Structure formats: structure tokens, C-alpha cells
Amino acid sequence: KPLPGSTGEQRADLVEIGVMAKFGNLELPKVTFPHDRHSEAVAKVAAPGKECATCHKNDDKGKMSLKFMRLEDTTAADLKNIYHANCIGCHTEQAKAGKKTGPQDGECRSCHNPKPMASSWKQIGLDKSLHFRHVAAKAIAPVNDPQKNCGACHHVYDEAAKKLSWVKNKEDSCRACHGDARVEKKPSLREAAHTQCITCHRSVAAAPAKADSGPVSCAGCHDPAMQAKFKVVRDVPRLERGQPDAAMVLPVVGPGAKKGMKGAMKPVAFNHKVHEAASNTCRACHHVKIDNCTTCHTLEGVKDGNFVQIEKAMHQPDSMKSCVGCHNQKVQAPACAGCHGFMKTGAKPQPEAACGVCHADPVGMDAKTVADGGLLKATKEQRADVAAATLAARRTTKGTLPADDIPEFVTIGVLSDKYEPSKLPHRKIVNTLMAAIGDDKLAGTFHTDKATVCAGCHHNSPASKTPPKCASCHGQDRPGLKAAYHQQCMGCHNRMKLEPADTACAECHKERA
Numbered sequence: 001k002p003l004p005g006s007t008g009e010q011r012a013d014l015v016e017i018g019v020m021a022k023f024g025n026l027e028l029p030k031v032t033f034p035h036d037r038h039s040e041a042v043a044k045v046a047a048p049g050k051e052c053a054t055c056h057k058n059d060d061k062g063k064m065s066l067k068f069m070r071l072e073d074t075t076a077a078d079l080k081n082i083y084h085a086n087c088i089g090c091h092t093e094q095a096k097a098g099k100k101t102g103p104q105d106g107e108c109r110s111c112h113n114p115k116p117m118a119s120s121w122k123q124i125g126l127d128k129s130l131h132f133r134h135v136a137a138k139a140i141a142p143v144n145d146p147q148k149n150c151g152a153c154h155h156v157y158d159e160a161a162k163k164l165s166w167v168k169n170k171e172d173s174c175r176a177c178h179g180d181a182r183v184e185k186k187p188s189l190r191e192a193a194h195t196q197c198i199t200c201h202r203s204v205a206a207a208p209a210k211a212d213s214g215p216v217s218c219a220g221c222h223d224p225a226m227q228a229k230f231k232v233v234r235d236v237p238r239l240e241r242g243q244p245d246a247a248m249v250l251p252v253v254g255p256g257a258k259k260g261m262k263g264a265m266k267p268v269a270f271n272h273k274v275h276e277a278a279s280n281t282c283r284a285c286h287h288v289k290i291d292n293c294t295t296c297h298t299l300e301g302v303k304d305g306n307f308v309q310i311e312k313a314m315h316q317p318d319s320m321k322s323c324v325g326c327h328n329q330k331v332q333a334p335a336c337a338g339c340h341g342f343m344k345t346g347a348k349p350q351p352e353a354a355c356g357v358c359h360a361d362p363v364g365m366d367a368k369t370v371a372d373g374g375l376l377k378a379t380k381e382q383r384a385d386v387a388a389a390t391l392a393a394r395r396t397t398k399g400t401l402p403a404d405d406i407p408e409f410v411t412i413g414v415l416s417d418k419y420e421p422s423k424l425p426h427r428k429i430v431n432t433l434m435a436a437i438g439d440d441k442l443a444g445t446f447h448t449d450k451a452t453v454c455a456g457c458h459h460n461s462p463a464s465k466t467p468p469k470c471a472s473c474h475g476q477d478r479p480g481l482k483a484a485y486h487q488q489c490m491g492c493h494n495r496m497k498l499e500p501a502d503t504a505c506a507e508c509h510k511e512r513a
């Protein structure tokens with residue numbers, strides 16, 4: 001790392017102007033334009049709310065253009081002139097006026113710099129806290145509703161009224177519909193944001209009410225040091241959009257043939273409300289749009305889902321979007337990692353004991369009826385009600401076996417030579433692992449017996465209050481007895497991150513002589 005004093009200046013301010021490349025190859029470098037420097041310099045000379053008007057024009061509606069001295073790109077010749085005439089224009093007059101200003105007519109490289117400075121730029125969005133702060137800001141006024149703020153920002157195209165409108169409980173993240181470039185009359189996310197966000201912030205700032213507003217300068221949203229200063233709400237209430245607290249995820253077959261696939265598992269009740277809280281975003285799971293998975297993911301798979309079948313969509317050990325997948329990742333947490341890194345949970349075929357945790361007999365419907373497909377042709381409401389009851393029927397372990405079955409100490413001296421036998425704080429470690437698990441819901445639901453966690457070290461043998469010796473399958477079943485101990489014992493202390501420069505071979509046994 002280069003000394004802190006020679007790392008150079010960075011801005012979140014920099015606009016790379018290269019729009020001309022839309023008309024061919026460039027003779028010279030793209031021009032680097034420090035936006036915040038310019039708007040601050042103008043806020044001084046421009047007296048009215050005309051600060052941005054100096055360089056941005058309005059359309060026939062009044063929506064400010066995000067283009068420089070123009071409403072639309074046109075001729076490679078018209079644009080080259082719009083820039084030099086207005087850019088050098090203003091620099092020239094200001095220089096006559098004795099003001100510090102930008103590059104003048106002959107100073108080509110100075111605008112066309114091949115070696116501009118470093119960006120400190122950073123992306124921004126509305127996480128749970130920031131979103132709630134807008135949901136709750138009385139300055140953003142309720143729109144088409146007695147109290148709900150949503151219509152101020154969210155909308156669908158009513159292909160009928162020919163108008164964009166706030167449909168209640170249809171609101172979805174800007175990314176669902178706004179992408180990298182613009183499709184048709186639909187802006188890119190970049191323009192979409194810059195339009196709505198900055199326009200509203202400026203309205204509030206300008207308003208008689210003098211209420212707090214949002215940033216307008218580039219660095220105010222995009223500088224990392226500026227983002228750190230946003231106040232954070234650590235209590236963000238649930239985001240209410242009409243979603244189910246409980247849901248039946250079903251083996252829907254594609255509206256193709258009925259190829260006579262039916263299904264091989266009982267259905268799955270899904271606790272939606274619990275997963276909302278444990279997730280940063282809806283889009284994490286609803287990765288295209290907020291809809292439902294079986295729209296695009298069916299038993300046999302459909303074009304609209306790139307044929308990723310529903311089994312794949314719910315199990316990919318590889319994928320954060322899938323049930324088992326995400327869970328496979330949650331298990332990488334230090335408290336879980338000690339058993340689970342040793343079990344290799346995402347790297348072997350998932351045990352059949354775990355299938356029934358999700359795939360359970362639904363509660364509140366006749367068994368025959370469920371095979372008959374009863375849940376498939378049934379109100380959204382009957383499914384909601386059935387899922388809630390199914391979820392509520394669910395068992396849960398807390399704690400493990402009773403201490404009298406868990407020896408307090410275990411001496412391992414089968415190998416004792418350079419070291420004395422290691423005295424294993426057996427019961428203490430179990431208690432602490434149970435303690436580390438806490439009241440974690442993933443743990444408490446997927447650990448189906450009180451004895452389950454014993455397989456976190458006593459693997460490959462039948463679940464038992466009396467497991468076999470390690471030397472059973474280890475020695476002369478790959479690692480030897482010593483490496484088995486060393487790999488499992490140090491393995492977990494490492495993954496659990498409880499000890500580094502504090503490591504002594506003395507921890508688990510005394511050296512002799």
C-alpha cells in the first residue's frame with residue numbers, strides 16, 4: 001500500500017464526457033468534468049433557483065434535461081460545437097472577469113486529459129433504513145391515499161389510461177423495470193434515479209417548509225465519506241405491500257401439457273414474514289420482479305424462466321436465490337462454521353432427514369385432497385390459511401440430550417507419546433456450542449433431534465447417545481487417527497475464530513520431558 005501521503009486526490013465528482021463516440025472513433029481523450037466544482041461555482045453567480053438552468057434546459061413539460069446545453073443528442077457536428085462554444089465560452093468570459101476558471105481555447109489536453117485523477121465514487125440505494133426514512137418523512141406528502149407515501153415514487157404503466165400511475169401494492173424496486181440502457185420510453189435506472197430523486201430533493205429544499213431533504217450534489221449521494229454520515233434507523237418496521245405472512249410453494253406445472261408430470265414430494269409451507277426480516281431486500285429472492293417463483297419456475301421448466309426447473313430453483317446448493325443454497329451460506333457463520341465446515345454441508349448431497357423439514361404434510365386439508373392436487377386449485381386464501389397452520393404445527397428442538405448422557409470429560413491418550421493425553425472439556429464444549437447456536441431459527445428447525453448436534457463431530461455413524469471411537473474408522477476412512485483429531489479439533493477453533501498469535505500446542509495437551 002502506497003504511503004497515505006502519496007495516494008492522490010480522489011473525487012466522486014467526475015463526469016467522463018465521451019458522448020461523441022456515439023458518432024464514431026474519438027480523435028482525443030474523453031473530457032473529465034468535475035461536476036460539483038462547477039455547480040458550487042455557479043450557485044454563487046446564479047441568484048435565483050437558476051443554478052442548474054445555466055447548463056441544463058427543460059423540456060416542454062418542465063422536467064430538467066440531464067444533458068448539457070441541449071434536450072437531445074443530434075449531430076456529431078452539432079454536439080462538438082455545443083461543447084466548445086459553451087464550455088470555452090464561459091471559461092473565456094470568466095477569465096476576462098478575473099475569475100478562477102476552466103481551460104481556454106487552445107488548452108486541448110487540459111479538458112482532453114489522458115491521465116485524469118482517481119474516482120472515489122460509490123453506488124447508493126435505499127436500504128431498509130433509508131427507505132423507511134422516506135416512507136416516514138412528512139415532507140413527502142401522501143399521494144392518492146390518506147397516509148401512504150408510496151405514490152410519490154412508485155408507479156406502473158396503466159396500459160389503457162395511457163398513463164404511469166401508482167398502483168397500490170404493486171410497487172417494486174426501480175430495477176425490476178429500469179435497466180442499464182433505456183428500452184423505449186423507459187429510462188435507464190441511471191436517468192430514472194437522477195430525475196426523480198434529485199428533482200424531489202430540490203423541491204423540498206426550495207419549499208417554504210424548510211424541511212430536511214436529500215442530497216443534490218454528486219458527492220452528497222456518491223461520496224463514501226458522505227454516506228457514512230446518513231443517520232440510520234435500527235428498527236425499520238416491516239415493509240407493508242400486501243404480502244403473505246405464510247405461503248404454499250407448489251409443484252405448479254407449466255400451462256403446457258398435462259409429459260404427465262405430477263410431483264414427487266409433499267408441498268412446502270414457507271414462512272414469508274420471518275424471511276423478510278432476515279433479508280436485506282425483497283429483490284434478493286425476487287430477483288427479476290416481485291411476483292411468485294412458479295410463474296417462471298415449473299415442474300418441467302419454461303422459456304420465461306430460462307427453463308430453470310423449480311427443483312433447481314429451490315435447491316441449487318450454489319445459489320443464494322435457492323432455499324437450500326442460501327441456507328448453505330448462512331451456515332458459514334462462525335458460530336455454525338465449526339460443525340458445518342467439518343460436515344461440508346453445501347458440498348455433499350443433502351441428507352434425506354432434511355427433506356421432511358420443508359416437505360411436510362400440510363395441516364388443515366384432507367391428505368387425499370392434497371395428492372388430488374387440492375392446493376393447486378384452491379383460493380390464495382385457503383393456501384395462506386393452510387400454510388400458517390402447517391408452519392404452526394412444526395416441531396422445534398431447544399437444547400440437546402440431558403447432561404447425564406453427555407460425559408463431562410473424555411481422555412484421549414490412545415496416541416500419547418510426545419504429549420500427555422488430552423483432557424477433552426467434553427460437556428463444556430457442547431453447552432457452549434448450544435449456547436453459540438442460541439435461538440437461531442435455522443438451527444432450531446433443521447436440528448430435528450436433540451441428539452442431532454452430536455453428529456457435528458461424531459459423523460458417519462448412526463445417531464446415538466453412545467457414538468463409536470474415532471479410532472473405529474481411523475488408522476491403519478482417509479485421515480489417520482492423529483490427523484483426524486488435529487483436523488477436527490483445530491479445524492473448529494479456527495472456523496469459530498475464538499483464539500491467532502495466542503496459539504500454543506499446549507492448549508489441548510501437555511508436552512512431556
Ligand code: HEM
Pocket residue numbers: 017018019020021025026027028029030031080083084087088091102103104105106107108109110111112
Ligand atoms: C484547440 C484544442 C482542442 C481541440 C483540437 C479539440 C478537439 C476536439 C474534437 C476533435 C472533439 C470531438 C471528439 C473526439 O474526437 O475526441 C472534441 C470534443 C470535446 N471537446 Fe475539445 N478540443 C480542444 C479543446 C477543448 C477544451 C479546451 C475543452 C474544455 C473547455 C474541450 C471540450 C470538449 C468536450 C466537452 C468535447 C465533447 C466530449 C466527447 O469527446 O464526447 N475541448 N474536441
Ligand code: HEM
Pocket residue numbers: 015017019033035038039042051052053054055056066067068069190194198216
Ligand atoms: C445543482 C444544479 C444541477 C444539477 C442537479 C445537475 C445534475 C446533473 C445530473 C443528474 C447529471 C447526469 C449525471 C451522470 O449521469 O453522469 C448532470 C450532468 C452534467 N451536468 Fe449537471 N447539474 C446541475 C448543474 C450543472 C451546471 C451549472 C453545469 C455547467 C457548469 C452542469 C453541467 C453538466 C454536464 C456537462 C454534465 C454531463 C452531461 C453532458 O455531457 O451532457 N450541470 N448534471
Ligand code: HEM
Pocket residue numbers: 031032033034037038041042054055068083086087088090091094100101102103110111
Ligand atoms: C461541458 C463544458 C465544460 C467542460 C468540459 C469544463 C471543464 C472544466 C475543467 C476540466 C475544469 C478544471 C480546471 C482546473 O482544474 O483548474 C473546469 C473548471 C471551471 N469551470 Fe468548466 N467546463 C465546462 C463548462 C463550464 C461552464 C459552462 C462554466 C460557467 C458556468 C464553467 C465554469 C468553470 C469554473 C468557474 C471553473 C473553476 C471553478 C473551481 O475553481 O473549482 N465551466 N471546467
Ligand code: HEM
Pocket residue numbers: 124125126127131134135140148149150151152153154171172173174175239240241280281282283284
Ligand atoms: C409505503 C409505500 C411504499 C411501499 C409499500 C414501497 C415498497 C417498496 C418495495 C417492496 C420495494 C422493493 C424492495 C426490495 O426489493 O428490496 C421498494 C423499492 C424502492 N422504493 Fe419504495 N415503497 C413505498 C414508498 C416509497 C417512496 C415514497 C419512495 C421515494 C421517496 C420509494 C422509493 C423506493 C426506491 C428508490 C426503491 C429502490 C431501492 C433500491 O434498490 O435502491 N418508495 N419500495
Ligand code: HEM
Pocket residue numbers: 124125126130133134137139140152153193196197198200201204212213214215221229230231
Ligand atoms: C432513488 C432516488 C433517491 C435517493 C438515492 C435518495 C436518497 C436520500 C438520502 C441519502 C437521504 C438522506 C440524506 C441525509 O441524511 O443527509 C434522503 C433524504 C430525503 N429524501 Fe431522498 N432519495 C431519493 C429520492 C427521493 C424522492 C423521489 C423524494 C420525494 C418523494 C425524496 C425525499 C426525501 C426527503 C424529504 C428526505 C429528507 C427526510 C428526512 O430525513 O427528514 N427522496 N434521500
Ligand code: HEM
Pocket residue numbers: 013014015035036123124125189190193194197198201214215216217218219220221222
Ligand atoms: C451530478 C453528480 C452526479 C453524478 C456525476 C452521478 C453519476 C452517476 C452514474 C455515472 C451512475 C451510474 C453508474 C453505473 O451505471 O454503474 C449513477 C447512478 C445513480 N445515481 Fe448518481 N450521480 C450524481 C449525483 C447523484 C445524486 C445527488 C443522487 C441522489 C439523489 C444520485 C443517485 C444515483 C442513483 C440512485 C443511482 C443508481 C445506482 C445504481 O445504478 O444502482 N446521483 N450516478
Ligand code: HEM
Pocket residue numbers: 249250251252262263264265266267268310311314315323324327350351352354355356357358359
Ligand atoms: C434432499 C431432500 C430433498 C429432496 C429429495 C427434495 C426434492 C424436491 C423435489 C423432487 C421437488 C419438486 C416438486 C415435487 O416433485 O414434489 C422439490 C420442490 C421444493 N423443495 Fe425440495 N427436496 C428436498 C429438501 C428440501 C428442503 C430442505 C427444502 C427447504 C429449504 C426444500 C424446499 C422445496 C421447495 C420450496 C420446493 C418447491 C415447492 C414444491 O413444488 O413443493 N426441499 N423438492
Ligand code: HEM
Pocket residue numbers: 239241242243244247248249250270272275276279281282283284285286290291292293294295
Ligand atoms: C419485503 C420484501 C418482499 C416483498 C414485498 C415480497 C412480496 C411477496 C408477494 C406479494 C408474494 C406473493 C406473490 C403472488 O402470489 O402474487 C411473495 C411470494 C414469495 N416470496 Fe416474497 N417478498 C419479499 C421478500 C422475500 C424474500 C427476502 C424472500 C426469500 C427469503 C421471499 C420469498 C418468497 C417466496 C418463496 C414466495 C412464494 C412464491 C411461490 O409460491 O411460488 N420474498 N412475496
Ligand code: HEM
Pocket residue numbers: 285286287288289291292293294295296297304305306308312313314316319320321322
Ligand atoms: C422468489 C421466487 C424465485 C426464486 C426463489 C427463484 C430462484 C431462481 C434460481 C435459484 C435460479 C438459478 C440459480 C441462479 O442463477 O442463481 C433462477 C434462475 C432464473 N429465474 Fe428465478 N426465481 C424466482 C422467481 C423468478 C421469476 C418470477 C422469474 C420471471 C419473471 C424468474 C426468472 C428466472 C430466469 C430467467 C432464470 C435464469 C437465469 C439464470 O440462469 O440465473 N425467476 N431463479
Ligand code: HEM
Pocket residue numbers: 249268269270271274275278279284285314320321322323324326327330357358440441442445
Ligand atoms: C422457498 C425456499 C425456502 C424455504 C422453504 C425456507 C425455509 C426455511 C425454514 C423452514 C426456516 C426456519 C424458520 C421458520 O420456518 O420460521 C428458514 C430460516 C431461514 N431462512 Fe429460509 N427458506 C427458503 C429460502 C431462503 C433463502 C433464499 C434465504 C436467503 C435469501 C433464506 C434465509 C433464511 C434465514 C436467514 C433463516 C433464519 C431465520 C432467522 O434466524 O430469523 N431462506 N428457512
Ligand code: HEM
Pocket residue numbers: 327330331333335336337338339340343345350351353354433434436437438440442443446447452453454455456457
Ligand atoms: C446457528 C448456526 C447454525 C445454523 C444456522 C445451522 C443450520 C443447519 C441447517 C440448515 C441444517 C440442515 C441442512 C442440511 O442438512 O443440509 C443443519 C444440520 C445439522 N447441523 Fe447445524 N446449524 C448451526 C450450527 C450447528 C452446530 C454448532 C452444530 C454442531 C454442534 C451443528 C450440527 C448439525 C448437524 C449434525 C446437522 C445434521 C447433518 C446431517 O443430516 O447429517 N449445527 N444445521
Ligand code: HEM
Pocket residue numbers: 412413414415416417418419420421422482485486489490493504505506507508509
Ligand atoms: C501445532 C501444535 C501441536 C502439535 C505440535 C501437536 C502434536 C501432536 C502429536 C505429536 C500428537 C500425537 C500423540 C503424542 O505424541 O502425544 C498429538 C495428538 C493430539 N493432539 Fe495435538 N498438537 C498440536 C496442537 C493441538 C491442538 C491445538 C489440539 C486441540 C484443538 C490438539 C489435539 C490433539 C489430540 C486430541 C490428540 C490425540 C491425543 C492422544 O491420543 O494422545 N493438538 N498432537
Ligand code: HEM
Pocket residue numbers: 400401405406407410411412424426429430433451453454455456457458464465466467468469470471
Ligand atoms: C450431546 C451430543 C453428544 C453426545 C451424547 C456425545 C457422547 C459421547 C460419548 C458417549 C463418547 C465416548 C467417551 C469415551 O470413549 O469414554 C464421546 C466421545 C467424544 N466426543 Fe462426543 N458426544 C456428543 C457431542 C460431541 C460433539 C459436538 C463433539 C465435538 C465438539 C464431540 C466430540 C467427542 C470426542 C472428540 C470424543 C472422543 C472420542 C475418541 O477420542 O475416540 N462430541 N462422546
Ligand code: HEM
Pocket residue numbers: 338339422423424425428429432433456457485488489490492493496498507508
Ligand atoms: C478432540 C479435539 C478437541 C480438543 C482436544 C479440544 C480442546 C479444547 C480445550 C482444552 C478448550 C478450553 C480452552 C481453555 O479453557 O483455555 C476448548 C474450548 C472450546 N472448543 Fe475445543 N477441542 C476439540 C475440538 C473442538 C471442536 C471440533 C469444536 C467445534 C465443534 C470445538 C469448540 C470449542 C469451543 C467453542 C470452545 C470454547 C468453550 C468455552 O471456553 O466455553 N472444540 N477446546
Ligand code: NA
Pocket residue numbers: 090093
Ligand atoms: Na455566463
Ligand code: NA
Pocket residue numbers: 105106
Ligand atoms: Na480554437
